[PDB]
Design a protein around this ligand. Structure first.
Ligand SMILES: OC[C@H]1O[C@@H](O[C@@H]2[C@@H](O)[C@H](O[C@@H]3[C@@H](O)[C@H](n4cc(COCc5cccs5)nn4)O[C@H](CO)[C@H]3O)O[C@H](CO)[C@H]2O)[C@H](O)[C@@H](O)[C@@H]1O
Ligand SMILES: OC[C@H]1O[C@@H](O[C@@H]2[C@@H](O)[C@H](O[C@@H]3[C@@H](O)[C@H](O)O[C@H](CO)[C@H]3O)O[C@H](CO)[C@H]2O)[C@H](O)[C@@H](O)[C@@H]1O
Length: 429
Protein backbone atom coordinates (compact mmCIF):
# COMPACT_ATOMS: atom_id res chain seq x y z
CA UNK A 1 0.00 0.00 0.00
CA UNK A 2 1.22 3.48 -1.00
CA UNK A 3 -1.95 5.31 0.19
CA UNK A 4 -0.02 7.85 2.30
CA UNK A 5 2.19 8.86 -0.67
CA UNK A 6 0.13 9.78 -3.75
CA UNK A 7 2.33 10.44 -6.80
CA UNK A 8 3.61 14.02 -7.07
CA UNK A 9 3.22 15.68 -10.48
CA UNK A 10 4.59 18.89 -12.00
CA UNK A 11 2.36 21.70 -13.29
CA UNK A 12 4.27 24.76 -14.52
CA UNK A 13 7.01 25.64 -12.00
CA UNK A 14 5.42 23.86 -9.00
CA UNK A 15 4.95 20.32 -7.61
CA UNK A 16 1.41 19.08 -6.77
CA UNK A 17 -0.11 16.10 -4.95
CA UNK A 18 -1.93 14.24 -7.76
CA UNK A 19 -4.91 13.29 -5.52
CA UNK A 20 -5.51 16.35 -3.31
CA UNK A 21 -4.25 19.08 -5.67
CA UNK A 22 -2.30 20.79 -2.85
CA UNK A 23 1.16 22.19 -3.68
CA UNK A 24 3.94 19.88 -2.49
CA UNK A 25 6.95 21.41 -0.71
CA UNK A 26 10.09 19.34 -0.14
CA UNK A 27 11.18 19.08 3.50
CA UNK A 28 14.09 16.74 2.97
CA UNK A 29 17.38 15.25 4.02
CA UNK A 30 20.19 13.49 2.10
CA UNK A 31 20.41 9.79 2.99
CA UNK A 32 23.46 7.90 1.73
CA UNK A 33 25.99 5.73 3.55
CA UNK A 34 29.62 5.40 2.38
CA UNK A 35 32.38 2.88 3.13
CA UNK A 36 35.20 3.61 5.62
CA UNK A 37 31.97 0.92 -4.02
CA UNK A 38 28.71 2.64 -2.95
CA UNK A 39 26.38 1.32 -0.21
CA UNK A 40 22.65 0.99 -0.98
CA UNK A 41 20.82 1.53 2.33
CA UNK A 42 17.43 1.19 0.55
CA UNK A 43 18.36 -2.41 -0.42
CA UNK A 44 19.01 -3.42 3.22
CA UNK A 45 15.90 -3.51 5.48
CA UNK A 46 17.95 -3.63 8.72
CA UNK A 47 19.52 -0.25 7.84
CA UNK A 48 16.51 1.62 6.41
CA UNK A 49 14.09 0.32 9.09
CA UNK A 50 16.56 1.47 11.80
CA UNK A 51 16.67 5.00 10.38
CA UNK A 52 13.05 5.67 9.28
CA UNK A 53 11.88 6.26 12.90
CA UNK A 54 14.60 8.94 13.28
CA UNK A 55 13.71 10.41 9.88
CA UNK A 56 10.08 10.59 11.12
CA UNK A 57 11.23 12.48 14.27
CA UNK A 58 13.03 15.02 12.02
CA UNK A 59 9.73 15.57 10.19
CA UNK A 60 11.04 15.03 6.64
CA UNK A 61 8.82 14.10 3.68
CA UNK A 62 11.68 13.51 1.18
CA UNK A 63 15.07 11.80 1.01
CA UNK A 64 17.81 12.41 -1.54
CA UNK A 65 19.62 9.19 -2.43
CA UNK A 66 22.75 9.46 -4.60
CA UNK A 67 23.24 5.79 -5.53
CA UNK A 68 21.26 2.52 -5.60
CA UNK A 69 22.23 -0.96 -6.80
CA UNK A 70 19.63 -1.76 -9.51
CA UNK A 71 20.22 -5.55 -9.22
CA UNK A 72 18.72 -5.58 -5.68
CA UNK A 73 15.15 -5.30 -4.38
CA UNK A 74 13.93 -1.98 -2.90
CA UNK A 75 10.23 -2.62 -2.19
CA UNK A 76 10.57 -3.17 1.60
CA UNK A 77 12.36 0.15 2.22
CA UNK A 78 10.27 2.10 -0.34
CA UNK A 79 7.03 0.77 1.21
CA UNK A 80 8.33 1.57 4.72
CA UNK A 81 9.10 5.14 3.59
CA UNK A 82 5.64 5.43 1.99
CA UNK A 83 3.99 4.39 5.28
CA UNK A 84 5.61 7.48 6.89
CA UNK A 85 4.66 9.81 3.99
CA UNK A 86 8.24 9.94 2.66
CA UNK A 87 9.31 10.37 -0.98
CA UNK A 88 12.68 9.78 -2.70
CA UNK A 89 14.71 11.94 -5.11
CA UNK A 90 17.26 9.65 -6.78
CA UNK A 91 20.42 10.23 -8.82
CA UNK A 92 20.72 7.91 -11.84
CA UNK A 93 24.53 7.95 -11.82
CA UNK A 94 27.13 6.51 -9.44
CA UNK A 95 30.82 7.43 -8.81
CA UNK A 96 32.20 4.86 -11.33
CA UNK A 97 29.45 5.38 -13.97
CA UNK A 98 28.85 9.12 -14.40
CA UNK A 99 29.39 11.76 -17.08
CA UNK A 100 33.07 12.59 -16.49
CA UNK A 101 33.43 16.39 -16.29
CA UNK A 102 37.15 16.12 -17.28
CA UNK A 103 36.43 13.97 -20.37
CA UNK A 104 32.68 14.10 -21.04
CA UNK A 105 30.85 11.39 -22.97
CA UNK A 106 27.22 10.35 -23.34
CA UNK A 107 27.47 6.69 -24.27
CA UNK A 108 25.85 3.25 -24.13
CA UNK A 109 27.58 2.35 -20.83
CA UNK A 110 26.26 5.39 -18.91
CA UNK A 111 22.84 5.19 -20.60
CA UNK A 112 22.46 1.50 -19.66
CA UNK A 113 23.21 2.46 -16.00
CA UNK A 114 20.47 5.12 -16.15
CA UNK A 115 17.99 2.65 -17.73
CA UNK A 116 18.78 0.04 -15.06
CA UNK A 117 18.04 2.50 -12.23
CA UNK A 118 14.82 3.66 -13.97
CA UNK A 119 13.64 0.06 -14.38
CA UNK A 120 14.51 -0.80 -10.76
CA UNK A 121 12.74 2.19 -9.14
CA UNK A 122 9.88 3.48 -11.34
CA UNK A 123 7.17 1.17 -9.91
CA UNK A 124 7.10 3.15 -6.62
CA UNK A 125 4.55 6.04 -6.39
CA UNK A 126 6.82 7.77 -3.83
CA UNK A 127 9.72 8.11 -6.33
CA UNK A 128 9.54 11.92 -6.66
CA UNK A 129 12.08 12.39 -9.44
CA UNK A 130 15.40 11.38 -10.97
CA UNK A 131 18.59 13.47 -11.28
CA UNK A 132 20.36 12.96 -14.65
CA UNK A 133 23.53 14.56 -13.25
CA UNK A 134 25.08 16.20 -10.19
CA UNK A 135 27.51 19.14 -10.54
CA UNK A 136 28.93 17.90 -13.84
CA UNK A 137 29.92 21.38 -14.97
CA UNK A 138 31.15 23.01 -11.73
CA UNK A 139 33.16 26.03 -12.94
CA UNK A 140 34.04 28.02 -16.07
CA UNK A 141 36.66 25.41 -17.19
CA UNK A 142 34.21 22.53 -17.87
CA UNK A 143 30.99 24.11 -19.19
CA UNK A 144 31.34 21.94 -22.34
CA UNK A 145 30.22 18.93 -20.24
CA UNK A 146 26.65 20.36 -20.03
CA UNK A 147 25.44 19.32 -23.54
CA UNK A 148 26.13 15.69 -22.54
CA UNK A 149 23.97 16.12 -19.42
CA UNK A 150 21.16 17.68 -21.51
CA UNK A 151 21.35 14.68 -23.88
CA UNK A 152 21.06 12.43 -20.80
CA UNK A 153 17.96 14.33 -19.61
CA UNK A 154 16.39 14.00 -23.08
CA UNK A 155 17.15 10.29 -23.38
CA UNK A 156 16.10 9.39 -19.81
CA UNK A 157 12.79 11.23 -20.37
CA UNK A 158 12.25 9.47 -23.73
CA UNK A 159 13.12 6.05 -22.24
CA UNK A 160 10.58 6.69 -19.45
CA UNK A 161 8.04 7.94 -22.03
CA UNK A 162 8.36 4.77 -24.16
CA UNK A 163 8.25 2.47 -21.08
CA UNK A 164 5.07 1.34 -19.28
CA UNK A 165 6.15 3.31 -16.16
CA UNK A 166 4.62 6.39 -14.55
CA UNK A 167 6.23 9.44 -16.19
CA UNK A 168 8.57 10.27 -13.32
CA UNK A 169 10.22 13.68 -13.91
CA UNK A 170 13.95 13.92 -14.74
CA UNK A 171 15.96 16.92 -13.53
CA UNK A 172 19.43 18.17 -12.66
CA UNK A 173 21.37 19.09 -9.51
CA UNK A 174 23.90 21.95 -9.80
CA UNK A 175 26.49 23.65 -7.57
CA UNK A 176 26.62 27.42 -6.79
CA UNK A 177 29.68 28.82 -8.62
CA UNK A 178 29.13 32.57 -9.17
CA UNK A 179 30.63 32.71 -12.68
CA UNK A 180 28.51 29.84 -14.12
CA UNK A 181 25.23 29.63 -12.13
CA UNK A 182 23.05 31.96 -14.26
CA UNK A 183 24.20 30.42 -17.56
CA UNK A 184 23.72 26.87 -16.20
CA UNK A 185 20.17 27.67 -15.06
CA UNK A 186 19.28 29.13 -18.47
CA UNK A 187 21.02 26.32 -20.39
CA UNK A 188 18.97 23.56 -18.72
CA UNK A 189 15.68 25.17 -19.84
CA UNK A 190 16.82 26.45 -23.30
CA UNK A 191 16.07 25.14 -26.79
CA UNK A 192 14.07 21.95 -27.39
CA UNK A 193 15.31 19.92 -24.38
CA UNK A 194 14.51 20.96 -20.80
CA UNK A 195 15.13 19.62 -17.32
CA UNK A 196 11.81 18.87 -15.57
CA UNK A 197 13.09 20.40 -12.31
CA UNK A 198 16.26 22.08 -11.06
CA UNK A 199 18.04 21.51 -7.72
CA UNK A 200 20.79 23.81 -6.40
CA UNK A 201 23.29 22.65 -3.79
CA UNK A 202 23.01 25.81 -1.73
CA UNK A 203 25.48 26.68 1.07
CA UNK A 204 25.28 30.51 1.10
CA UNK A 205 23.57 30.74 4.52
CA UNK A 206 26.11 30.05 7.30
CA UNK A 207 25.32 30.38 11.03
CA UNK A 208 22.87 33.07 12.16
CA UNK A 209 22.58 34.79 8.76
CA UNK A 210 19.60 36.62 7.17
CA UNK A 211 17.53 36.58 3.97
CA UNK A 212 19.28 39.73 2.69
CA UNK A 213 22.87 39.14 3.83
CA UNK A 214 23.08 35.41 2.96
CA UNK A 215 22.40 35.94 -0.76
CA UNK A 216 19.00 34.17 -0.53
CA UNK A 217 17.17 37.37 -1.58
CA UNK A 218 19.30 37.77 -4.75
CA UNK A 219 18.90 34.04 -5.59
CA UNK A 220 15.12 34.28 -5.10
CA UNK A 221 14.91 37.32 -7.42
CA UNK A 222 17.08 35.52 -10.02
CA UNK A 223 14.75 32.47 -10.08
CA UNK A 224 11.40 34.34 -10.01
CA UNK A 225 9.44 33.19 -13.09
CA UNK A 226 11.83 30.28 -13.85
CA UNK A 227 9.69 27.85 -15.91
CA UNK A 228 10.35 24.61 -13.91
CA UNK A 229 10.26 23.74 -10.18
CA UNK A 230 13.37 24.86 -8.31
CA UNK A 231 14.57 23.85 -4.85
CA UNK A 232 17.69 23.38 -2.73
CA UNK A 233 18.91 19.85 -3.57
CA UNK A 234 21.35 20.34 -0.66
CA UNK A 235 21.64 22.91 2.13
CA UNK A 236 23.35 23.25 5.50
CA UNK A 237 26.56 25.26 5.71
CA UNK A 238 28.45 24.00 8.78
CA UNK A 239 30.78 26.99 9.38
CA UNK A 240 29.00 27.67 12.69
CA UNK A 241 27.99 24.69 14.86
CA UNK A 242 25.77 23.26 16.09
CA UNK A 243 24.00 24.26 12.87
CA UNK A 244 20.98 26.40 13.84
CA UNK A 245 19.36 25.81 10.41
CA UNK A 246 17.73 29.29 10.49
CA UNK A 247 17.77 29.21 6.65
CA UNK A 248 14.73 26.91 6.99
CA UNK A 249 12.62 29.81 8.36
CA UNK A 250 13.55 31.88 5.28
CA UNK A 251 13.09 29.02 2.77
CA UNK A 252 9.46 28.25 3.76
CA UNK A 253 8.54 31.89 4.54
CA UNK A 254 6.18 33.87 2.31
CA UNK A 255 8.85 35.54 0.12
CA UNK A 256 10.71 32.32 -0.78
CA UNK A 257 7.76 29.86 -0.80
CA UNK A 258 6.30 31.61 -3.90
CA UNK A 259 9.54 30.80 -5.82
CA UNK A 260 11.19 27.73 -4.22
CA UNK A 261 9.73 24.24 -3.74
CA UNK A 262 11.68 23.63 -0.50
CA UNK A 263 14.94 21.78 0.01
CA UNK A 264 16.92 18.89 1.46
CA UNK A 265 19.42 19.23 4.32
CA UNK A 266 22.85 17.64 3.85
CA UNK A 267 22.83 15.12 5.50
CA UNK A 268 21.58 12.29 7.77
CA UNK A 269 24.82 10.30 8.43
CA UNK A 270 27.93 11.81 10.07
CA UNK A 271 30.99 10.69 8.08
CA UNK A 272 34.00 12.52 9.58
CA UNK A 273 32.84 15.65 7.71
CA UNK A 274 30.70 17.45 10.35
CA UNK A 275 27.59 17.31 8.06
CA UNK A 276 25.57 14.56 9.83
CA UNK A 277 22.63 14.88 12.22
CA UNK A 278 23.22 11.36 13.59
CA UNK A 279 26.30 9.17 14.03
CA UNK A 280 26.18 5.37 13.69
CA UNK A 281 28.21 3.87 16.59
CA UNK A 282 30.36 0.68 16.64
CA UNK A 283 27.25 -1.29 17.76
CA UNK A 284 25.32 -0.08 14.61
CA UNK A 285 22.94 2.03 16.76
CA UNK A 286 21.90 5.64 16.12
CA UNK A 287 23.47 8.40 18.25
CA UNK A 288 21.64 11.72 17.81
CA UNK A 289 23.99 14.71 17.31
CA UNK A 290 23.52 18.40 18.38
CA UNK A 291 22.28 19.48 14.88
CA UNK A 292 19.29 17.07 15.02
CA UNK A 293 17.10 19.07 17.46
CA UNK A 294 17.68 22.32 15.52
CA UNK A 295 16.67 20.80 12.17
CA UNK A 296 13.70 19.06 13.87
CA UNK A 297 12.53 22.33 15.48
CA UNK A 298 13.00 24.33 12.25
CA UNK A 299 11.08 21.85 10.03
CA UNK A 300 8.26 21.73 12.64
CA UNK A 301 7.81 25.54 12.55
CA UNK A 302 7.97 25.61 8.73
CA UNK A 303 4.47 26.06 7.27
CA UNK A 304 4.84 27.09 3.60
CA UNK A 305 1.92 29.04 2.11
CA UNK A 306 1.39 27.38 -1.27
CA UNK A 307 -1.31 27.57 -3.90
CA UNK A 308 -3.69 24.87 -5.08
CA UNK A 309 -3.47 23.32 -8.55
CA UNK A 310 -6.87 24.73 -9.62
CA UNK A 311 -6.04 28.38 -8.80
CA UNK A 312 -2.53 28.06 -10.33
CA UNK A 313 -3.99 26.88 -13.68
CA UNK A 314 -6.03 30.08 -13.52
CA UNK A 315 11.28 28.61 -26.16
CA UNK A 316 14.09 30.30 -24.18
CA UNK A 317 17.37 31.32 -25.82
CA UNK A 318 20.51 29.31 -24.99
CA UNK A 319 23.44 31.34 -23.58
CA UNK A 320 25.86 32.55 -26.25
CA UNK A 321 29.36 31.05 -26.44
CA UNK A 322 32.17 33.15 -24.92
CA UNK A 323 35.71 31.76 -24.65
CA UNK A 324 36.68 31.06 -21.02
CA UNK A 325 33.18 31.91 -19.77
CA UNK A 326 30.54 29.72 -21.44
CA UNK A 327 31.39 26.90 -23.86
CA UNK A 328 28.27 24.67 -24.00
CA UNK A 329 26.91 24.23 -27.54
CA UNK A 330 23.13 24.12 -28.03
CA UNK A 331 23.68 21.09 -30.32
CA UNK A 332 23.55 17.89 -28.25
CA UNK A 333 25.03 14.44 -28.85
CA UNK A 334 22.70 11.82 -30.37
CA UNK A 335 20.91 9.12 -28.41
CA UNK A 336 23.37 6.27 -27.70
CA UNK A 337 22.62 3.31 -30.00
CA UNK A 338 23.18 0.01 -28.15
CA UNK A 339 22.59 -2.13 -31.28
CA UNK A 340 25.01 -0.20 -33.52
CA UNK A 341 27.68 -0.32 -30.82
CA UNK A 342 26.90 -4.02 -30.10
CA UNK A 343 27.52 -4.70 -33.83
CA UNK A 344 31.16 -3.62 -33.28
CA UNK A 345 31.49 -6.51 -30.77
CA UNK A 346 30.41 -8.91 -33.56
CA UNK A 347 32.21 -7.57 -36.66
CA UNK A 348 35.52 -5.99 -35.54
CA UNK A 349 38.65 -8.13 -36.12
CA UNK A 350 40.54 -6.72 -33.11
CA UNK A 351 38.94 -6.30 -29.68
CA UNK A 352 40.06 -5.18 -26.23
CA UNK A 353 38.54 -6.30 -22.90
CA UNK A 354 37.90 -3.56 -20.24
CA UNK A 355 46.06 4.37 -17.23
CA UNK A 356 45.87 1.94 -20.18
CA UNK A 357 43.19 4.01 -22.00
CA UNK A 358 45.17 7.29 -22.15
CA UNK A 359 48.31 5.52 -23.43
CA UNK A 360 46.41 3.34 -25.94
CA UNK A 361 44.27 6.21 -27.30
CA UNK A 362 47.41 8.41 -27.55
CA UNK A 363 49.22 5.62 -29.43
CA UNK A 364 46.42 4.48 -31.78
CA UNK A 365 45.12 7.99 -32.61
CA UNK A 366 48.58 9.01 -33.93
CA UNK A 367 48.34 6.10 -36.45
CA UNK A 368 44.65 6.33 -37.46
CA UNK A 369 42.03 9.10 -37.56
CA UNK A 370 40.05 8.99 -34.28
CA UNK A 371 37.51 11.69 -35.30
CA UNK A 372 34.76 9.03 -35.37
CA UNK A 373 35.01 8.55 -31.56
CA UNK A 374 35.56 12.20 -30.51
CA UNK A 375 32.82 14.27 -28.90
CA UNK A 376 33.18 18.05 -28.59
CA UNK A 377 30.58 19.85 -26.46
CA UNK A 378 32.05 23.26 -27.37
CA UNK A 379 31.75 22.92 -31.15
CA UNK A 380 28.78 20.51 -31.16
CA UNK A 381 30.69 17.97 -33.29
CA UNK A 382 30.02 14.37 -32.26
CA UNK A 383 31.65 11.45 -34.06
CA UNK A 384 29.62 8.57 -35.50
CA UNK A 385 30.82 6.11 -32.81
CA UNK A 386 31.34 8.64 -29.99
CA UNK A 387 28.28 7.08 -28.25
CA UNK A 388 29.92 3.63 -27.92
CA UNK A 389 31.71 2.36 -24.80
CA UNK A 390 35.37 3.25 -24.15
CA UNK A 391 36.54 -0.32 -25.03
CA UNK A 392 34.36 -0.40 -28.18
CA UNK A 393 35.93 2.94 -29.23
CA UNK A 394 39.44 1.60 -28.57
CA UNK A 395 38.65 -1.66 -30.42
CA UNK A 396 37.43 0.29 -33.48
CA UNK A 397 40.74 2.18 -33.71
CA UNK A 398 42.84 -0.98 -33.17
CA UNK A 399 40.82 -2.71 -35.92
CA UNK A 400 41.29 0.26 -38.27
CA UNK A 401 45.08 -0.04 -37.74
CA UNK A 402 44.90 -3.82 -38.40
CA UNK A 403 43.07 -3.24 -41.70
CA UNK A 404 45.47 -0.36 -42.58
CA UNK A 405 48.51 -2.67 -42.26
CA UNK A 406 46.63 -5.39 -44.18
CA UNK A 407 48.75 -8.36 -43.02
CA UNK A 408 45.50 -10.35 -42.64
CA UNK A 409 47.18 -12.84 -40.26
CA UNK A 410 45.03 -12.48 -37.08
CA UNK A 411 47.83 -10.56 -35.29
CA UNK A 412 46.33 -7.39 -33.77
CA UNK A 413 48.88 -4.52 -33.70
CA UNK A 414 48.98 -3.84 -29.92
CA UNK A 415 50.97 -5.82 -27.31
CA UNK A 416 48.64 -6.25 -24.32
CA UNK A 417 46.96 -9.24 -22.63
CA UNK A 418 43.54 -7.51 -23.00
CA UNK A 419 43.87 -7.47 -26.83
CA UNK A 420 42.44 -10.44 -28.76
CA UNK A 421 41.53 -11.38 -32.33
CA UNK A 422 37.75 -11.72 -32.64
CA UNK A 423 36.87 -15.03 -34.33
CA UNK A 424 33.25 -13.85 -34.90
CA UNK A 425 34.65 -11.27 -37.38
CA UNK A 426 35.40 -14.17 -39.77
CA UNK A 427 31.76 -15.43 -39.83
CA UNK A 428 29.95 -13.87 -42.83
CA UNK A 429 23.88 -5.27 -38.65
O1 LIG B 1 29.34 13.73 -13.16
C1 LIG B 1 30.21 14.52 -12.34
C2 LIG B 1 31.09 13.60 -11.50
O2 LIG B 1 30.28 12.59 -10.89
C3 LIG B 1 31.09 11.80 -10.00
O3 LIG B 1 30.26 10.87 -9.30
C4 LIG B 1 29.35 11.58 -8.45
C5 LIG B 1 29.86 11.54 -7.01
O4 LIG B 1 31.09 12.26 -6.92
C6 LIG B 1 28.83 12.17 -6.09
O5 LIG B 1 29.30 12.12 -4.74
C7 LIG B 1 28.34 12.75 -3.87
C8 LIG B 1 29.00 13.90 -3.13
O6 LIG B 1 29.37 14.92 -4.06
C9 LIG B 1 28.02 14.47 -2.11
N1 LIG B 1 28.63 15.60 -1.37
C10 LIG B 1 27.96 16.60 -0.81
C11 LIG B 1 28.91 17.35 -0.28
C12 LIG B 1 28.70 18.65 0.49
O7 LIG B 1 29.45 19.70 -0.11
C13 LIG B 1 29.64 20.76 0.83
C14 LIG B 1 30.40 21.91 0.16
C15 LIG B 1 31.73 22.08 0.20
C16 LIG B 1 32.14 23.17 -0.47
C17 LIG B 1 31.16 23.87 -1.05
S1 LIG B 1 29.73 23.09 -0.70
N2 LIG B 1 30.08 16.78 -0.54
N3 LIG B 1 29.86 15.76 -1.18
O8 LIG B 1 27.64 13.44 -1.18
C18 LIG B 1 26.91 12.42 -1.87
C19 LIG B 1 26.39 11.39 -0.86
O9 LIG B 1 27.42 11.09 0.08
C20 LIG B 1 27.82 11.73 -2.88
O10 LIG B 1 27.08 10.71 -3.57
O11 LIG B 1 27.59 11.46 -6.20
C21 LIG B 1 27.05 11.61 -7.52
C22 LIG B 1 25.67 10.96 -7.59
O12 LIG B 1 25.79 9.55 -7.41
C23 LIG B 1 27.98 10.94 -8.52
O13 LIG B 1 27.44 11.11 -9.84
C24 LIG B 1 32.14 11.04 -10.81
O14 LIG B 1 32.95 10.26 -9.92
C25 LIG B 1 33.01 12.03 -11.56
O15 LIG B 1 33.91 11.31 -12.42
C26 LIG B 1 32.14 12.95 -12.39
O16 LIG B 1 32.95 13.96 -13.00
O1 LIG C 1 33.42 30.06 -5.47
C1 LIG C 1 33.10 28.79 -6.04
C2 LIG C 1 32.25 28.01 -5.04
O2 LIG C 1 31.08 28.77 -4.73
C3 LIG C 1 30.26 28.19 -3.72
O3 LIG C 1 29.12 29.01 -3.42
C4 LIG C 1 29.48 30.30 -2.88
C5 LIG C 1 29.13 30.32 -1.39
O4 LIG C 1 30.00 29.42 -0.70
C6 LIG C 1 29.18 31.71 -0.74
O5 LIG C 1 28.58 31.51 0.55
C7 LIG C 1 28.64 32.44 1.65
C8 LIG C 1 28.54 33.94 1.37
O6 LIG C 1 27.63 34.28 0.33
C9 LIG C 1 28.08 34.58 2.69
O7 LIG C 1 27.94 35.99 2.54
O8 LIG C 1 29.02 34.28 3.74
C10 LIG C 1 29.34 32.89 3.96
C11 LIG C 1 30.39 32.76 5.05
O9 LIG C 1 29.92 33.38 6.26
C12 LIG C 1 29.79 32.25 2.64
O10 LIG C 1 30.13 30.88 2.81
O11 LIG C 1 28.50 32.67 -1.57
C13 LIG C 1 28.98 32.73 -2.92
C14 LIG C 1 28.36 33.92 -3.65
O12 LIG C 1 26.93 33.92 -3.59
C15 LIG C 1 28.69 31.38 -3.59
O13 LIG C 1 29.01 31.40 -4.98
C16 LIG C 1 29.75 26.83 -4.19
O14 LIG C 1 29.01 26.19 -3.13
C17 LIG C 1 30.89 25.93 -4.66
O15 LIG C 1 30.32 24.81 -5.34
C18 LIG C 1 31.83 26.66 -5.62
O16 LIG C 1 32.97 25.85 -5.89
Amino acid sequence: SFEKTPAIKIVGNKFFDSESGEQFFIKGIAYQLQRSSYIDALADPKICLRDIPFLKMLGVNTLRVYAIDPTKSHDICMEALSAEGMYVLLDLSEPDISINRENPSWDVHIFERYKSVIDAMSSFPNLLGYFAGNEVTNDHTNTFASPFVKAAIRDAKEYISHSNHRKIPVGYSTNDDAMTRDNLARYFVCGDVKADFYGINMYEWCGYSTYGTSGYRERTKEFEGYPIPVFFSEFGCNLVRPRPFTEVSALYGNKMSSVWSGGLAYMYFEEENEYGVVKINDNDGVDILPDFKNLKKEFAKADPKGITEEEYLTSVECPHIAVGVWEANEKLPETPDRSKCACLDEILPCEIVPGKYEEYFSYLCSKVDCSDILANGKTGEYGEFSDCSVEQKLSLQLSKLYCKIGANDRHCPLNDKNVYFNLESLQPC
